[PDB]
Amino acid sequence: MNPFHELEPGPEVPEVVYALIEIPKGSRNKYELDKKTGLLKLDRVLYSPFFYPVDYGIIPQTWYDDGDPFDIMVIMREPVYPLTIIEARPIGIMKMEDSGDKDWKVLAVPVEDPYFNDWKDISDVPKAFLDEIAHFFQRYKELQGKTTKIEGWGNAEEAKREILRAIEMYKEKFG
Amino acid sequence: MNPFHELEPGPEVPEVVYALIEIPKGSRNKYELDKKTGLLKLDRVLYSPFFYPVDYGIIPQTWYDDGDPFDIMVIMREPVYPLTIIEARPIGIMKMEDSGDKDWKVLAVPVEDPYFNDWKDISDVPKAFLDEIAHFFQRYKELQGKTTKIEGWGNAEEAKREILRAIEMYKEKFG
Amino acid sequence: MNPFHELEPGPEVPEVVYALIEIPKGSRNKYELDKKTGLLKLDRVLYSPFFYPVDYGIIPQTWYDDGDPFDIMVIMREPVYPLTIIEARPIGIMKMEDSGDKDWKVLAVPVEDPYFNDWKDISDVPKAFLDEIAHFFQRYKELQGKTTKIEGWGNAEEAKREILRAIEMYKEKFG
Amino acid sequence: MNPFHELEPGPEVPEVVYALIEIPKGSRNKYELDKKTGLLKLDRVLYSPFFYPVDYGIIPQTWYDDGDPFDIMVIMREPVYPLTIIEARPIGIMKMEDSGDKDWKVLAVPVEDPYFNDWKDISDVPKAFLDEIAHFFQRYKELQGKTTKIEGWGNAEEAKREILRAIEMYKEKFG
Amino acid sequence: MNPFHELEPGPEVPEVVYALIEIPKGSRNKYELDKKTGLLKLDRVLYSPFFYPVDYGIIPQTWYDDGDPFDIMVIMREPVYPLTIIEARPIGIMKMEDSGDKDWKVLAVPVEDPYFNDWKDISDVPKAFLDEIAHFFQRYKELQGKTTKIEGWGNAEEAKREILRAIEMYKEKFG
Amino acid sequence: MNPFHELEPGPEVPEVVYALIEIPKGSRNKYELDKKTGLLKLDRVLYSPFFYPVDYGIIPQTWYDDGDPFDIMVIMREPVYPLTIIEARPIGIMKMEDSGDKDWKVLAVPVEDPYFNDWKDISDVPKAFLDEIAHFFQRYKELQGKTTKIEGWGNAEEAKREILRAIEMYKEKFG
Ligand SMILES: [Mn+2]
Ligand SMILES: [Mn+2]
Ligand SMILES: [Mn+2]
Ligand SMILES: [Mn+2]
Ligand SMILES: [Mn+2]
Ligand SMILES: [Mn+2]
């Protein structure tokens, strides 16, 4: 029972996808779905006193250029628990490379929080909030000798194209 | 692996049942067991700044008039995590309709918290605490245009009859 | 010393005011400044499982129609501690009556959280969030038999005029 | 100003007293009012992984056999912040000796939490909860080599007589 | 899907084992893996206001003298969620009997928290921290009439011998 | 009264100093004592999702090259509340420049937490923890366009000399 393989990418792809959350906002512990058992695993404790600024996880049945499930960041007011599924509306995409392939990350809002009803595109997000997320990813591995370049942000349409591409990559890899 | 179908309704039905908790007390996020995978899912974020006043979930292998597993509310001092099983003693039952069928909810205490040892019936609960729970359910969907009528509270015996009825409903539906 | 009397209403009244916080967002306990002494006092525990949706306090050296210091609600991502001073930009005002008294409340954002840099008027707030604040005040005293009437929301300009009026009422009262 | 000296012992002594809280329920840090100044001070960190089971503080303008202000324990569902004033109804008293000193402690409920409306005497408290409070004081200083003797619990009447006695000791000491 | 049987004892036994956490540090609720379904279950609420001083759980595919999976205590700065796997370096072992067979417990640190990089043996732990853990286990069931004798602490080498013995016990019992 | 002016620098200067805490570990809100009044004020919300890695405050009756009270960082397992006094043993000093000003900060442990009994100098601190504190100050104002230079860490002896120097600067400034 590995929810990464068992759940479909979403109920109305790519307008609404499922986000399987691994890390709640506010966590300094970096969790991930164990590849084998699908249990939650501690990947590492961040080397710096930083916390995930968003609920962070993966879209089920996706694969990406970086050889991982496609990352998704969901803006939740109250963080969820790890392994919670959220119906999420993609509104943009963070463009970054940590190495050699794209490690881009979808930015999304919960469909079922009315607070975010008018958040439909990247332009709807407060600039300082985008800058805080980009900064987190730019620096959170700095003490691990890792450097990352944030290229910028793409819009909702680009996010949705990339989601479809990641769904196709998963089908091509696993069938 | 869906714990709703896999776990028995309880170790000594209906004097002690299992409560599979979906929502810890204090949550504004309304979680539920995903029908298909049995993973935790965000159903919605409550539209108002209210929090679940009890640990809330379902009794495994039950079905009810409203076409859902039978709801159970467990009074915990320290909330549990979602998907935690609690051995629970039914002490009463909240009578309400949100629509057209009974959406009644068992009120229970943890067998293994000695704080609640003398809580055996509805009359053992502070009146204001019952009124706070009823009020939560009366108003928590008010901004979703939903109206609910709380009829009142039934006693431990009535709660136990309803649990047995819900166990029979599940057997009749699924076998 | 009593901070309600010792602090000025703000550093750039009424464009920027001091909010002296009594109740952090997420509190079910209703604290209030004892103007006998400067000390935080538990006014009551809310009768329902509701939490303050905003950091809630008073503007120093103000008074109001309801015989209290003028209320201010500050939108904070991370709640502050009681008795914390926040430099706040008024962006609107909630118009409500409590138990027959005009009991309006300023809505404001923290000047020094860049997240809110572009919140400058009431139209900048998500409608669902305004609705949730109003609903809270509509229902939080319902089990206490008290009645509130929410009239609606005024804009930043009206909030600022009310601030000036409340500043004069303090002079009228104590001066 | 020093709130231990500036506040009265209560608004309706000894039926209702002020509890000036030093330690919120759930704290492992042992705070205490610095009666040099009014300020909260870290007295120590408990040597064991135990937490205060009650909101713990002092009654203003009291003194006691052990050379401290008279201790009061308030049963709060949601803990208050340190230095919060609570209007408290004494319902009993814990009789204990600390390091050879009479060090009894009032047990009280908040007047303004309707949850506790019918708690008026020591027989209203769950026995397991009384046991847990006593056990905490029995063992919390064990790694510090200190010995405590818990004698038992007295009723509301005895608590109130002790409150009056402690009020007179303050006059004897400072008056 | 029972993670106790499904996961291997560790990636580099016995230098690095997997710790499947049942109870996060700070919990008063005592959780355990349900024997049958492998869901988290509330075993009991501790009878005293004590909290687990470490993240507590089991090593997968182990069995011990006491007829349970072998216990492991992991020192985490930020507690994990129940059912999280942690790669853990054994540094010592708490020797205790609660009854008649050894109920010894491995003490470990997370490999992937650099804070603990130089914690490799029992001598690396602050004495007061060992004393706090031993005290917790000595007293936490005191109100349940249970008495426990803490014998002392063994070193990293002894911990590793015992882990290997527990791995062999599991193979002998289940195959 | 203003605790920065009313409290002495410590009970056994400079071996033991008072730390007046402004910011609890784990805070993203940057609080500071308003030396206009004694009151806690929100200075800003950090622009990045970082949290203070230490309990952060000032030493009473000190002043410094940067025109502020001398900064002190206290390593607390459980964070204290703002405005809490902690008796602290200096063990080292972080040497850094903020915006062109010498802005060094004492590192200290609480005298009354036995966990830290053997932390008496800078070599007693895990290197990763020193690195995480420095990194925090290296990057926490990066989105604010401010530059900091971390020089390194000095030992307990140097910290204590700096404390004496800062005590004299307060006399120079106010005396
Ligand atoms: Mn990726
Ligand atoms: Mn139902
Ligand atoms: Mn008002
Ligand atoms: Mn005493
Ligand atoms: Mn064992
Ligand atoms: Mn400085």
Looking at residue F33, which CATH number applies to its domain?
3.90.80.10
Within 10 Å of residue F156's Cβ, how many Cβ atoms?
23
Q: In whole angstroms, give the CA distance from residue D74 to residue D112.
A: 12
Within 10 Å of residue E146's Cβ, how many Cβ atoms?
12
Maximum C-alpha span of chain F = 41
Using the beta-carbon criterion (under 8 Å), do F40 and C83 form an inter-chain contact? yes
From residue D130, alpha-carbon distances to A72, D16, D53, E128, F27 in Å are 49, 21, 10, 29, 35
Can you give the length of chain D in residues? 175
Around C95, how many Cα atoms within 13 Å sit in the side-chain half-sphere? 10
From residue A150, alpha-carbon distances to A156, B65, C114, D113 in Å are 18, 54, 20, 51
**Resolution (Å) of this entry:** 1.9
Neighbours, chain D (3 or more CB pairs < 8 A): B, C, E, F
Q: In whole angstroms, give the CA distance from residue B138 to residue B133.
A: 9
Which residue numbers of B have CB closer than 8 Å to A's CBs?
A: 1, 27-29, 31, 34, 37, 39-45, 47, 81-82, 143
D100, burial (CB in 10 Å: exposed 0-12, middle 13-18, buried 19+):
exposed
* Chain F residues touching E118 at Cβ < 8 A: 126-127
Handedness of CA F167, F172, F173, F175 (dihedral sign): positive
Evaluate whether chains A and E are touching (3 or more beta carbon pairs less than 8 Å apart). Answer: yes
* Tokens (6 digits) for E156: 């990293």
Q: In whole angstroms, give the CA distance from residue C105 to residue D66.
A: 48
Q: Are E78 and E17 in contact (CB under 8 A)?
A: no
Ramachandran angles phi, psi of D107, nearest 5°:
-105, 130
Within 10 Å of residue C143's Cβ, how many Cβ atoms?
16
Using the beta-carbon criterion (under 8 Å), do A44 and E113 form an inter-chain contact? yes
Within 10 Å of residue C44's Cβ, how many Cβ atoms?
17
Q: In whole angstroms, give the CA distance from residue D30 to residue E114.
A: 30
From D113, which residue of chain B is nearest by alpha-carbon distance?
A: B128
Q: Are D51 and E50 in contact (CB under 8 A)?
A: yes
Instruction: Give C69's DSSP letter.
Output: P
Among candidates D24, D93, D26, B75, which has minimal Cα distance to E49?
Answer: D26
Q: Are E33 and E82 in contact (CB under 8 A)?
A: no
Q: In whole angstroms, give the CA distance from residue E48 to residue E36.
A: 28
Instruction: Give A69's DSSP letter.
Output: P
Total domain count for chain E? 1
Using the beta-carbon criterion (under 8 Å), do F139 and A48 form an inter-chain contact? yes
Q: In whole angstroms, give the CA distance from residue B125 to residue F20.
A: 44
* Tokens (6 digits) for B170: 């599940």
- What technique was this entry resolved by? X-ray
Name the one residue in this structure whose structure tokens are 């029992």: E122
What's chain B's Rg over C-alpha atoms? Answer: 15
Residue F172 in 3-state DSSP? Answer: helix
> Nearest CA of chain D to the CA of B77: how many Å?
9
C12, burial (CB in 10 Å: exposed 0-12, middle 13-18, buried 19+):
exposed
Within 10 Å of residue F165's Cβ, how many Cβ atoms?
15
Residue D104 in 3-state DSSP? Answer: coil
Among candidates E44, E32, E45, E8, which has minimal Cα distance to E82?
Answer: E32
Q: In whole angstroms, give the CA distance from residue A21 to residue A59.
A: 9
From residue C54, alpha-carbon distances to C132, C137, C152 in Å are 10, 11, 17
| Pairing of β F148-155 and β F85-98 | antiparallel
In single-letter form, the type of residue at position E66 comes to D
Among candidates E76, E74, E26, E78, which has minimal Cα distance to E50?
Answer: E26
Residue A13 in 3-state DSSP? Answer: coil
Among candidates F163, F148, F51, which has minimal Cα distance to F105?
Answer: F163
Q: Are B104 and B148 in contact (CB under 8 A)?
A: no
What's chain F's Rg over C-alpha atoms? Answer: 15
Name the one residue in this structure whose structure tokens are 């379902």: B58
- Closest CB to A37: pick one of E6, E87, E112: E6
For chain E, report the end-to-end CA distance as a whole number of angstroms: 18
What's chain A's Rg over C-alpha atoms? Answer: 15
Q: Are E55 and E18 in contact (CB under 8 A)?
A: no
Instruction: Give F81's DSSP letter.
Output: P
> Which parts of chain D are beta strand (E)?
17-23, 29-33, 40-45, 55-58, 71-74, 85-98, 101-102, 105-110, 148-155
From residue E53, alpha-carbon distances to C141, E73, E77, E133 in Å are 40, 9, 11, 6
Q: In whole angstroms, give the CA distance from residue F104 to residue B167.
A: 68
For chain F, report the end-to-end CA distance as a whole number of angstroms: 18
Q: Which residues are CB-neighbours of A39 under 8 A, at least 6 positions away? A: A33, E3, E7, E20, E83, E84, E85
* Chain B residues touching E34 at Cβ < 8 A: 85
Residue range(s) defining the domain that contains residue F145: 1-175
Around B40, how many Cα atoms within 13 Å sit in the side-chain half-sphere? 21
> Nearest CA of chain B to the CA of D114: how many Å?
6
Ramachandran angles phi, psi of B43, nearest 5°:
-70, -55
Dihedral of the alpha carbons of E161, E163, E168, E169, in degrees to the nearest 10: 120
Handedness of CA B110, B113, B115, B119 (dihedral sign): positive
Residue F6 in 3-state DSSP? Answer: helix
Can you give the length of chain A in residues? 175
Q: In whole angstroms, give the CA distance from residue A118 to residue B143.
A: 17
From residue D83, alpha-carbon distances to B22, D23, F85 in Å are 36, 9, 13
> CA angle at residue D51 from E45 to C37, to 5 degrees?
130
Q: In whole angstroms, give the CA distance from residue A52 to residue B115.
A: 37
Among candidates A119, A153, A116, A121, which has minimal Cα distance to A134?
Answer: A153
Q: Which residues are CB-neighbours of B79 under 8 A, at least 6 positions away? A: B24, B25, B26, B27, B55
Among candidates C97, C85, C90, C48, which has minimal Cα distance to C73?
Answer: C90
Q: In whole angstroms, give the CA distance from residue D7 to residue A146.
A: 57
Q: Are A157 and C147 in contact (CB under 8 A)?
A: no
Among candidates B78, B72, B77, B158, which has minimal Cα distance to B122?
Answer: B158
Among candidates C26, C104, C27, which has minimal Cα distance to C69?
Answer: C104
Percent composition of chain B: helix, strand, coil (DSSP 3-state, to 5): 25, 30, 45
Using the beta-carbon criterion (under 8 Å), do B132 and C47 form an inter-chain contact? yes
Ligand lying closest to the C-alpha of residue D99: 4
Among candidates F66, C46, B169, A32, which has minimal Cα distance to E112?
Answer: A32
